[PDB]
Design a protein around this ligand. Structure first.
Ligand SMILES: [Cu+2]
Lengths: 28, 21
């Protein structure tokens, strides 16, 4: 399902999705 | 980009996978 994700809620979602792979958080 | 799109618009968890290492 589609997501409305701002601020810290976006990095939680990144953490969940990527897990041990890790991720980059790169705003504009 | 993703940070803006997810917040200003909406995004999918599949779109988020593009940001995994
Ligand atoms: Cu909140």
């Amino acid at each position: 399902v589609n997501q409305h994700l701002c601020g810290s809620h976006l990095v939680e979602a990144l953490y969940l999705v990527c897990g041990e792979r890790g991720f980059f958080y790169t705003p504009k | 980009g993703i940070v803006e799109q997810c917040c200003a618009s909406v995004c999918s968890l599949y779109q988020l996978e593009n940001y995994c290492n």
